[PDB]
């Protein structure tokens, strides 16, 4: 029976339709453009807007 | 005088 | 039985070659003019101390300024990060809690662990304590991660092979997910809150439609247990880092691993992992006694946190981006923010 | 400042008050770990430690001794697989590992657990108070003469009583004889590969002996003792 | 003794020992009570040290003529020198052995140890002694002149020997149980040798370095006109050098000898 399970569950993933890591990858790498100047962490903030002094 | 010296307890009393 | 097997690997072989074949770019070389971030220093603003023991299990406010904080003492603390004051100290009645969590009102936070049972309590009560306003019984094993959706929907990780949506007022689980084969350690839920992703000790991470039901998506690729799992600012893609002392990051139409952050030197495990606000600065515990701070888009290190005398287990980033709190054995929070 | 700070740093100090009492009586009471399979009689210990009072996935039992307080974890309704939730355990006193040694089947699964608790890292500190458990079992099982231990292990032809044996009075060479076999087969692995900072101690137990709070005591006295010596550069 | 070589240990005491408080001060897996003796007996050491060193400077400097005052400010100025070196002393001592008795209860009393100490409770007995410490330094140098204060400081370091010794050996007479037990235990792929190298060089360096100047102390009251004597007594220099060898000699074998503390010294010194 659980053979069959994981046959099953593993047939549902064939239908699925995938997309080229071309523009698979355009989530990230064109997210980080769209939030690059708001991560304090990435680019540091003046220490006067910071709660954590 | 006074003469100073190491710490105390030293020449004899 | 020989029928089942053959079934199973014909159907795994298509579903790799069709994996295998839209890998037409790797997103290593399309970085290429990707400016590496350089070197992240962070200090340590605020050492938040009063555990006794390891913690095992932070999580932050959606304010950014609030946060939980489960350790084996038994003891479950509210702080505020600003003033290092404290706002509540729940007594736990199982001392091996695993995890917590808070709820995005405000009104509720969440913790389980050995005990099996994912207990809610309500804070914005204010009677003089805070009680037990619900526990939520059915599963078989450990109990590794508890996340909310909203104030009466919690989706919960267990140690045996299942995940299970409930329904707080009720009290039954409305959905189980079923198909692991090892235990699963760590689920991390969207931002669309629509699926979530659960990556388990066998080496294996699975997203779940929560209204259907029903497992979308299996991925492979490492060797040994899965530690942590979260999603990327989208729900569309989510770095697992596992046991074999190696990171990976999984899209979810790619269906298929694109990075891999490893290092020589690195042989020590990992534990948990948290992103920051940009996708670009992927936080992980090890369990050499520091963390680390890679680049998604570079799998290049870009920054160290030394600073804990033992195992980091916990990790999280502020909805805001200000700050990023570590836990640790030492019974020490550190928040770290980046100098100016 | 303000009014609503002062009544933060109020609400914090109380909350740093109740933090103080509770650290004394955490620091106080020391955690054990009782790990055992299934034929091994771990709840009939459990059951018959309750004397020395004060689906759920584990079970609290507190205990004294002697004006010294326990916690004992028993952890039950969980899988198979234990290599997850054992790591939770780096700083208890000691784990207390059962064996049945008298099923002679699975004593070498025991083996092979206790030789994976006994190596595992988070536990290269703790010590192991190893329970034989069912001794009577054993004894009328080699004395009857059925299922000879030389079936299933080969050493035990060239093995005989070590010289620190303490045979209990009224007892056979025989059942002595396989009975520290079985002990030997245990402290090898023991000693064979963790350094000095964690040993195991072998009791012969019974499922129903009254003496085990006690005895669990001592080697607790013993592995606080051995630890701090270490750390004093004596032992 | 030259000069140079009373101030050089002075100077390697007070390094060793300011490093000493701070990787206590600057760790938390090492703010047990233990730790709080080993960092009242790297101030009392300090103190010891950088004390006699500027006597040592001050006597350099009024024996000769580069700085004199009066009878009367000279008088007061080596008061308080000897004071502070009194209170030191007596403090130095009294952390040794609070480190003995915690080693003791922790092992003799391992069950209860958290019932019996606390970290407020290392406070309150530091504070005592420091208190104390300063009384007894205070009337033993405005009262120098009588064999009254001679014999209590004698009696205080005997009394303080006695309990060292007994404090150690008994640890180590235990260590060779447990070493003697595992020993038995079988396929044994464990030395007294480690045992007997801690107990020597604890209670050989306490002794080397503090039992010379309370001789010369022992021996000015019982015999002081006699050749023998006298020429022990004429020695007070090569034992004032003792007692700072000591202050440069704990931390070796205190708080170099712990791996946490050694881990901090590496984190510190890469700083
Ligand atoms: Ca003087």
């Not at chain 4, 963790?194 to 900072?197: F, H």
């Given at each position: 029976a659980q053979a069959r399970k994981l046959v099953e569950q593993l047939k549902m993933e064939a239908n699925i339709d995938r997309i080229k890591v071309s523009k698979a990858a355009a989530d990230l790498m064109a997210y980080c453009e769209a939030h690059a100047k708001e991560d304090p962490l990435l680019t540091p903030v003046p220490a006067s807007e910071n709660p954590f002094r | 005088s006074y003469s100073m010296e190491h710490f105390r307890w030293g020449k004899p009393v | 039985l020989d029928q089942l097997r053959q079934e199973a690997e014909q159907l795994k072989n298509q579903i790799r070659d069709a994996r295998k074949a839209?890998?037409?770019?790797?997103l290593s070389q399309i970085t290429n003019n990707i400016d590496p971030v350089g070197r992240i220093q962070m200090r340590t603003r605020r050492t938040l101390r009063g555990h006794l023991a390891k913690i095992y299990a932070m999580h932050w406010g959606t304010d950014s300024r609030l946060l939980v904080s489960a350790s084996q003492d038994g003891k479950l603390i509210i702080w505020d990060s600003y003033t290092t004051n404290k706002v509540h100290a729940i007594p736990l009645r199982s001392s091996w809690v695993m995890t917590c969590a808070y709820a995005p009102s405000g009104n509720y936070v969440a913790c389980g662990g050995l005990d099996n049972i994912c207990s809610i309590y309500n804070?914005?009560?204010?009677?003089?304590n805070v009680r037990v306003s619900r526990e939520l019984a059915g599963h078989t094993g450990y109990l590794s991660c508890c996340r909310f959706l909203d104030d009466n929907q919690i989706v919960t990780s267990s140690g045996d092979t299942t995940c299970a949506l409930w329904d707080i007022e009720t009290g039954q689980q409305t959905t189980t997910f079923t198909g692991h084969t090892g235990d699963v350690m760590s689920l991390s839920l969207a931002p669309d809150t629509r699926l979530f992703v659960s990556g388990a000790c066998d080496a294996s991470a699975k997203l779940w439609d929560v209204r259907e039901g029903m497992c979308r998506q299996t991925f492979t690729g490492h060797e040994s247990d899965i530690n942590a799992i979260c999603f990327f600012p989208n729900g569309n893609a989510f770095a697992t880092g596992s046991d074999d002392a190696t990171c990976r990051l999984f899209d979810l139409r790619a269906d298929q691993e694109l990075m891999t952050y490893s290092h020589d030197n690195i042989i020590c495990g990992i534990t948990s992992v948290s992103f920051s606000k940009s996708g670009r600065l992927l936080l992980a515990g090890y369990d050499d006694f520091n963390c680390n701070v890679w680049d998604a888009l570079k799998a290049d290190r870009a920054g160290v946190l030394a600073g804990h005398d033992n195992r980091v287990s916990c990790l999280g980033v502020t909805d805001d981006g200000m700050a990023v709190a570590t836990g640790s054995w030492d019974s020490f929070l550190k928040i770290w923010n980046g100098s100016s | 400042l303000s009014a609503e700070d002062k009544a933060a740093v109020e609400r914090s100090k109380m909350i740093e008050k109740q933090l103080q009492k509770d650290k004394q009586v955490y620091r106080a009471t020391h955690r054990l770990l009782l790990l055992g399979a299934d034929n091994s009689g771990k709840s009939t210990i459990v059951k018959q430690m309750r004397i020395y009072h004060v689906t759920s996935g584990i079970f609290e039992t507190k205990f004294q001794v002697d004006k010294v307080n326990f916690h004992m974890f028993d952890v039950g309704?969980?899988?198979?697989?234990?290599?997850?939730?054992?790591?939770?355990?780096?700083?208890?006193?000691a784990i207390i590992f059962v064996v049945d040694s008298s099923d002679y089947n699975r004593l070498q699964e025991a083996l092979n657990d206790f030789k994976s608790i006994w190596n595992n890292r988070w536990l290269r500190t703790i010590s192991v108070i190893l329970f034989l458990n069912k001794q009577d079992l054993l004894a009328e099982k080699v004395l009857a003469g059925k299922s000879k231990i030389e079936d299933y292990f080969p050493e035990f032809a060239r093995y005989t009583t070590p010289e620190d044996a303490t045979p209990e009075p009224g007892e056979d060479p025989r059942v002595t004889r396989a009975k520290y076999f079985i002990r030997d087969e245990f402290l090898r692995i023991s000693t064979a590969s963790?350094?000095?900072?964690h040993y195991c101690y072998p009791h012969f137990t019974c499922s129903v002996d009254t003496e085990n709070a006690r005895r669990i005591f001592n080697d607790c006295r013993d592995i606080i003792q051995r630890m701090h010596l270490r750390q004093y550069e004596l032992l | 003794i030259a000069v140079e070589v009373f101030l050089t240990l002075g100077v390697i005491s007070l390094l060793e020992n300011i490093l000493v408080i701070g990787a206590i001060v600057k760790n938390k897996n090492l703010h047990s009570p233990m730790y709080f003796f080993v960092c009242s007996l790297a101030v009392a050491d300090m103190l010891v040290s950088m004390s006699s060193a500027w006597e040592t400077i001050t006597i350099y400097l009024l024996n000769n003529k580069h700085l004199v005052i009066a009878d009367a400010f000279v008088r007061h100025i080596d008061n308080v020198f000897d004071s502070m070196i009194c209170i030191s002393v007596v403090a130095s001592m009294c952390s040794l052995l609070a480190i003995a008795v915690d080693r003791y209860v922790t092992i003799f009393y391992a069950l209860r140890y958290h019932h019996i100490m606390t970290a407020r409770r290392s406070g309150a007995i530091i504070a005592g002694i420091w208190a104390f410490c300063t009384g007894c330094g205070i009337v033993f140098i405005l009262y120098s002149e009588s064999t009254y204060v001679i014999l209590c400081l004698i009696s205080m370091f005997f009394a303080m020997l006695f309990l060292l010794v007994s404090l150690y050996i008994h640890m180590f007479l235990l260590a060779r149980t447990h070493v003697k037990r595992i020993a038995a235990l079988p396929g044994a792929s464990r030395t007294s040798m480690q045992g007997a190298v801690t107990v020597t060089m604890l209670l050989g360096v306490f002794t080397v370095c503090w039992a010379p100047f309370f001789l010369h102390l022992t021996l000015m009251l019982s015999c002081p006109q006699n050749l023998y004597c006298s020429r022990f007594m004429s020695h007070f220099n090569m034992y004032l050098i003792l007692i700072m060898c000591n202050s440069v000699m704990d931390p070796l074998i205190y708080?170099?000898?712990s791996q946490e503390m050694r881990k901090t010294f590496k984190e510190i010194i890469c700083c």
């Open positions: - | - | 839209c890998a037409d770019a790797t804070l914005k009560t204010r009677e003089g | 309704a969980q899988r198979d697989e234990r290599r997850k939730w054992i790591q939770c355990f780096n700083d208890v006193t963790g350094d000095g900072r | 708080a170099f000898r």
